[PDB]
From a paper:
We demonstrated that the TCR from the 1E6 T cell clone bound to HLA-A*0201–ALWGPDPAAA using a limited footprint and very weak binding affinity. Here, we solved the structure of the 1E6 TCR with 7 altered peptide ligands (APLs) determined by our previously published combinatorial peptide library (CPL) screening, 2 of which mapped within human pathogens. Concomitant with our global analysis of 1E6 TCR binding to the APLs, we observed a common interaction element, consistent with our previous findings, that utilized TCR residues Tyr97α and Trp97β, forming an aromatic cap over a central GPD motif that was present in all of the APLs. Ligand engagement is dominated by peptide interactions, but hotspot-like interactions with the central GPD motif enable the 1E6 TCR to tolerate peptide residues that vary outside of this region, explaining how T cells expressing this TCR may cross-react with a large number of different peptides.
The low number of contacts between the 2 molecules most likely contributed to the weak binding affinity of the interaction. In order to examine the mechanism by which the 1E6 TCR engaged a wide range of peptides with divergent binding affinities, we solved the structure of the 1E6 TCR in complex with all 7 APLs used in Figure 2. The 1E6 TCR used a very similar overall binding modality to engage all of the APLs, with root mean square deviation ranging between 0.81 and 1.12 Å2 (compared with 1E6-A2-ALWGPDPAAA). The TCR CDR loops were in a very similar position in all complexes, apart from some slight deviations in the TCR β-chain; the peptides were all presented in a similar conformation; and there was minimal variation in crossing angles of the TCR (42.3°–45.6°). Overall, the 1E6 TCR used a canonical binding mode to engage each APL with the TCR α-chain positioned over the MHC class I (MHCI) α2-helix and the TCR β-chain over the MHCI α-1 helix, straddling the peptide cargo. Interactions between these 2 TCR and 3 peptide residues accounted for 41%–50% of the total contacts across all complexes, demonstrating the conserved peptide centric binding mode utilized by the 1E6 TCR.
Residue numbers in the entry:
A (entry chain C): 1 to 10
B (entry chain A): 1 to 276
C (entry chain B): 0 to 99
D (entry chain E): 3 to 246
E (entry chain D): 3 to 199
Write the structure that this text describes.
């Protein structure tokens, strides 16, 4: 089960 | 005993192509259970183990939406990283992300991690506390500042310590027949010379799961490593693993040496010895 | 950009018996970057419809892959893995040793 | 902020409808929502870096959303139907605002898709006096404006005194009344009040105007009825003080 | 599915107000309350992760994830809290919000000294066309839509002076002059007393 909804950009 | 759920993300820039190649895979322990490839036709997160096929459509839409969203973020990362290091637009570069949680034999939370690499080198990583960051260089410091300002550690800690473990446990139950199995290594020894004074003894472990294993050569019962070669553990392709360990012995002396095999899948260690 | 050449293992899935269906594996690992070319070879000639696992990587970020195919080993047929990669001036051929 | 266009649209069914949104520059998430009156919002779609990420709320058939670049999204309905009438909102955001569930909203597009333009009428607008009685013991300035007979219900009412829009002393109804069988096909009515000191109404040099912006037909729309084309227009009524 | 009570709430200024929402999917982890003035976009008030209570000025939001029940309390309510309130929620796999249908809140302003008074009012252009203004009545009184004949009547709205601080309710009714006018206008409803004659 992935983390989300998303990750911040570098 | 202890268990893991880990996600691996790789994203490769292709100047002259429309988009980076994005690949994502998920593991529980040594067993792969999902994948996504940005170039594959499905444009879908795909099952790779029999037990997750049980999940309903909501699970699969969610997982595919999240991985697609991940690929977009990595796409912008590749462009901003390129600027940070002042690199040419002509070369292929790579971003890699790994995250997951460990759980003890009581299935409760041990450990969380979330690491990020650019061109095969540590870039930024969540420390053990899951509250702060380790940054490899100054490009990464700018990112750390941004991520600290955005409270990003907080989001990930909630996932690592809660949701990740909750799903890992759910997977362990639903895949118990294969995830909680253990396959004893099948073992044998092999014998080869050179001319006169030397020979090689090679001790094999085949078809074992999980992949952790210890192969030890003793002379006269003495744990001795001098001139001992362990090949990296290797997948068989059917879900099991293989490994061998060799010693080069003065010939005549072969009976003195003993191979020791340890594997949670077997109740006590094995001893093999060359017999001709 | 730092680079690591691949380690290569060629081997069968089950102990080889002549005339019996098996799977030939080429496991490449330790490499960076991830663009790699791997062929399985029979008597010098490349085998068609080889499959491979999904790209992953290790604690040190280096990549690994397994390539594999059904084959039926024989006394005389030589089998090999051929690997090309930016760090190699020439494709590296590692022949399958049954005893290994 | 987020800029949405058009603010109002009134059209016949069958037409293509295109709704537009410019997010706040720098934002890389864009959301399109729809709200039907006396109900809640519902997400149609959102985008991240111009790529649609979730479109589960998008209708199966006549709806289409795009984001050709970071500064612009469209939502298209072809062909439009009356049930598509709604307010359509656009919002934009960033990851760090989204972690606190913050989102920036456009002012919305109010869309009326009508079965027939023959039903469209602009308002008639009357102002009424202070009452004889009310003025002396209360000693404040009373007046009311009525906007009658309009359809659909896309109207912005405003009071002007001298050359200036005025808010103090103002209260117009939140919702328009219908002259109806409560049958959607009705025309509407709206009131507003304005008060200032009695000294104002009675005596001076007092420019006093109830103004109503109606949104109706554009120039694209064909019209052949004997009566004036009910185009988008401002209609007004006014009054001067001390006037039987 | 988010279930929310629609039904207009009308409370007096100063009152505590309670709004709430029920849901069905246990994967919702983020819960939000929005306020929306008539003809405008929604404004975030409060947001909760988990279960729990958050206070902020006059507002408290709470989340009971085992009852699947969430609430917002507004203390010491003000005229400017009048609006539709919407709850919204989501989980962790999408930024898609699921909204409840909304609850309409009217907070009736406190009126210092009523002077209920009903005035007849004639058309500026011409005459004969007329309309009745009932105004300066207290915010205990309630006003009734006519289902009787075709007489037209607007609910009360509140007029706000500023600088010089004065408020007053007002309402309006009319009908073409089939001579049943100002007295019969409130065979619908009326609380207190004054008039023209």
């Amino acid at each position: 089960y992935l983390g989300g909804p998303d990750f911040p950009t570098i | 005993g202890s268990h893991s759920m880990r996600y691996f993300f790789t994203s490769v820039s292709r100047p002259g192509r429309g988009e980076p190649r994005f690949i994502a895979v998920g593991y529980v322990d040594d067993t792969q259970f999902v994948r996504f490839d940005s170039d594959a036709a499905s444009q879908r997160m795909e099952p790779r183990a029999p037990w997750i096929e049980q999940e309903g459509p909501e699970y699969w839409d969610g997982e595919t939406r999240k991985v697609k969203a991940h690929s977009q973020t990595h796409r912008v990362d590749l462009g901003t990283l390129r600027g940070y290091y002042n690199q040419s637009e002509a070369g292929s570069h790579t971003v890699q992300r790994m995250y997951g949680c460990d759980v003890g034999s009581d299935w409760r939370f041990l450990r969380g991690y979330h690491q990020y690499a650019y061109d095969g080198k540590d870039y930024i990583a969540l420390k053990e506390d899951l509250r702060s960051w380790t940054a490899a260089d100054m490009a990464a410091q700018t990112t750390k500042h941004k991520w600290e300002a955005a409270h990003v550690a907080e989001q990930l800690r909630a996932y690592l310590e809660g949701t990740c473990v909750e799903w890992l446990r759910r997977y362990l139950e639903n895949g118990k027949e294969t995830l909680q199995r253990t396959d004893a290594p099948k073992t044998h020894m092999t014998h080869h010379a050179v001319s006169d004074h030397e020979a090689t003894l090679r001790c094999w472990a085949l078809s074992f799961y999980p992949a952790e294993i210890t192969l030890t050569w003793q002379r006269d019962g003495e744990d001795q490593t001098q001139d001992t070669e362990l090949v990296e553990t290797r997948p068989a392709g059917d879900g099991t693993f293989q490994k061998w360990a060799a010693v080069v012995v003065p010939s005549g002396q072969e009976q003195r040496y003993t191979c020791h095999v340890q594997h949670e899948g077997l109740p006590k260690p094995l001893t093999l010895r060359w017999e001709p | 950009m730092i680079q690591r050449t691949p380690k290569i293992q060629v081997y069968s899935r089950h102990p080889a018996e002549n005339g019996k269906s098996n799977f030939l594996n080429c496991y490449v690992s330790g490499f960076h970057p991830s663009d790699i070319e791997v062929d399985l070879l029979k008597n010098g000639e490349r085998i068609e419809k080889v499959e491979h696992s999904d790209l992953s990587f290790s604690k040190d970020w280096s990549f690994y892959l397994l390539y594999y195919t059904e084959f039926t080993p024989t006394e005389k047929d030589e089998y090999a893995c051929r690997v090309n990669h930016v760090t190699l001036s020439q494709p590296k051929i590692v022949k399958w040793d049954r005893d290994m | 902020g987020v800029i949405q266009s058009p603010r109002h649209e009134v059209t016949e069914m069958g037409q293509q409808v295109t709704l537009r949104c410019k997010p706040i520059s720098g934002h890389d998430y864009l959301f399109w929502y729809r709200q039907t009156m006396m109900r809640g919002l519902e997400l149609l779609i959102y985008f991240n870096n111009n790529v649609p990420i979730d479109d589960s709320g998008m209708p199966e058939d006549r709806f289409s959303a795009k984001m050709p670049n970071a500064s612009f999204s469209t939502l298209k309905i072809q062909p439009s139907e009356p049930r598509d009438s709604a307010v359509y909102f656009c919002a934009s955001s960033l990851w760090e605002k989204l972690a606190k569930n913050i989102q920036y909203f456009g002012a919305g597009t109010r869309l009326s898709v009508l079965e027939d333009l023959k039903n469209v009428f602009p308002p008639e607008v009357a102002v009424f006096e202070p009452s004889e009685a009310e003025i002396s013991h209360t000693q404040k300035a009373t007046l009311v404006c009525l906007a009658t007979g309009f359809y659909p219900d896309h109207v912005e009412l405003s009071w002007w005194v001298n050359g200036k829009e005025v808010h103090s002393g103002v209260c117009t109804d939140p919702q328009p009344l219908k002259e109806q069988p409560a049958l959607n096909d009705s025309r509407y009515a709206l009131s507003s009040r304005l008060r200032v000191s009695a000294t104002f109404w009675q005596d001076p040099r007092n420019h006093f105007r109830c103004q109503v912006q109606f949104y109706g037909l554009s120039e694209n729309d064909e019209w052949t009825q004997d009566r004036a084309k009910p185009v988008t227009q401002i209609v007004s009524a006014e009054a001067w003080g001390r006037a039987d | 599915e988010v279930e929310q009570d629609p039904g207009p709430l009308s409370v007096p200024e100063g009152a505590i107000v309670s709004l709430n929402c029920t849901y069905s999917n246990s994967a919702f982890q983020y819960f939000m309350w929005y306020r929306q003035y008539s003809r405008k976009g929604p404004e975030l008030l409060m947001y909760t992760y988990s279960s729990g209570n958050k206070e902020d000025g006059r507002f408290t939001a709470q989340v009971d994830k085992s009852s699947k029940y969430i609430s917002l309390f507004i203390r010491d309510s003000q005229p400017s809290d009048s609006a539709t309130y919407l709850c919204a929620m989501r989980g962790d796999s999408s930024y898609k919000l699921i909204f409840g249908s909304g609850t309409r809140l009217l907070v009736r302003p406190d009126i210092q000294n009523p002077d209920p008074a009903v005035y007849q009012l004639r058309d500026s252009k011409s005459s004969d066309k007329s309309v009745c203004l009932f105004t300066d009545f207290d915010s205990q009184t309630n006003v009734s839509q006519s289902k009787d004949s075709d007489v037209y009547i607007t609910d009360k709205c509140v007029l706000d002076m500023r600088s010089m601080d004065f408020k007053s309710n007002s309402a309006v009714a009319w009908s073409n002059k089939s001579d049943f006018a100002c007295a019969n206008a409130f065979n619908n409803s009326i609380i207190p007393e004054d008039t023209f004659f």
